[PDB]
Structure 1
Amino acid sequence: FCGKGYHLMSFPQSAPHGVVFLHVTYVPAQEKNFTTAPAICHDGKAHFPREGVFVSNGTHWFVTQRNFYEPQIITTDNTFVSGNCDVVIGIVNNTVYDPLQPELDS
């Protein structure tokens, strides 16, 4: 509606018998291939990302936002436990880091 790309804001300009709009948009330029999976299995339960999608760089799996590549370690704070691993199709296996575990031990 405000030009090609993700709309951010726009600017008005006067014109003879009309108006001129300067639409500022967010358009990505570079991209990279990444192996994905809809969910992961930690201890038999299916973990789905609250915000984002699971990606893999060939050796480890990370979770990042859809529009930008910001890989983060998958934890229980970024994923919600729901269902079972049997009903999900294409599910993979990955260990979910728990931030509560090193605090109780230290």
Structure 2
Amino acid sequence: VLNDILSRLDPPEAEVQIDRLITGRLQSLQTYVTQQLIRAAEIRASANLAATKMSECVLGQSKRVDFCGKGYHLMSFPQSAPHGVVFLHVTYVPAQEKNFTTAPAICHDGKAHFPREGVFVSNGTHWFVTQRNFYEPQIITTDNTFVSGNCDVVIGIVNNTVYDPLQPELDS
């Protein structure tokens, strides 16, 4: 207690006592300030991360994997909180899945057909082309698939027929 030292000693040695006290308290203050500075650097890093998430997650739609919630990111909603923010990340997650036999491409007339968007699948007997994130089987035609070269090079090709929409119209 500084008051006790001032009330109990004259300046000649009160100065030494107060010097010791001042040195101790100054060291404590410096330690506290350094701790605060390092923690503020931590919080600044977290705040930059939060700002980046708000920019690229709320004001848009991030395709960065796992950066905006587990699964495929749909959107985000921000919420305040005492000295922080809370993101509700709305994401799309496939739930029910089925096995299928698949082929990278199919011959029709020697030429090979590759799917524009989606993959070829077979339920055992027939072959469809379905988008790769949701089983939506569609008949294989020349507007779902594009030709390239011939089917002596691709590995794993399977035979099938590629229905052509223009042929029935031409016949009719």
Question: Of Structure 1 and Structure 2, which has the larger fraction of its residues in strand?
Answer: 1
- Quote how far apart the aligned CAs of 1:84 are: 1.3
Question: Of Structure 1 and Structure 2, which has the larger fraction of its residues in helix?
Answer: 2
Greater RCO (Cα-Cα under 8 Å, separation 6 or more): 1
- Quote how far apart the aligned CAs of 1:27 are: 0.3
- Quote how far apart the aligned CAs of 1:73 are: 0.2
Task: Find the residue that maps to 2:120 and give its secondary structure.
Answer: strand
Does 1:87 find its partner at 2:147? no
Among 127, 131, 140, the residue aligned to 1:61: 127
1:49 aligns to what?
Answer: 115
- Quote how far apart the aligned CAs of 1:54 are: 0.2
In 1, the alpha carbon distance for the partners of 2:170 and 2:163 equals 14
Task: Find the residue that maps to 1:32 and give its secondary structure.
Answer: strand
- Quote how far apart the aligned CAs of 1:74 are: 0.3
Query: In the TM superposition, what whole-angstrom CA distance separates every residue of 1:40-93 from its partner, at most 9, and x where no partner exists?
Result: 000001100011100000010000001000000000001000021111111011
Task: Find the residue that maps to 1:101 and give its secondary structure.
Answer: helix
Structure 2 unmatched ranges of 5 or more? 1-66
Bigger-Rg structure (1/2):
2
Taking structure 1 as the reference length, the TM-score comes to: 0.98
- Quote how far apart the aligned CAs of 1:35 are: 0.2
Structure 1 unmatched ranges of 5 or more? none
The percent identity for this pair of structures is 100
Query: In the TM superposition, what whole-angstrom CA distance separates every residue of 1:1-52 from its partner, at most 9, and x where no partner exists?
Result: 0111000000010100000100000001100000000000000011000111
List structure 1 runs of 4+ shifted beyond 4 angstroms: none
Count of matched residue positions in the alignment of Structure 1 and Structure 2: 106
In 2, the alpha carbon distance for the partners of 1:23 and 1:70 equals 26
In 1, the alpha carbon distance for the partners of 2:101 and 2:90 equals 32
In 2, the alpha carbon distance for the partners of 1:89 and 1:67 equals 24
Task: Find the residue that maps to 1:26 and give its secondary structure.
Answer: strand
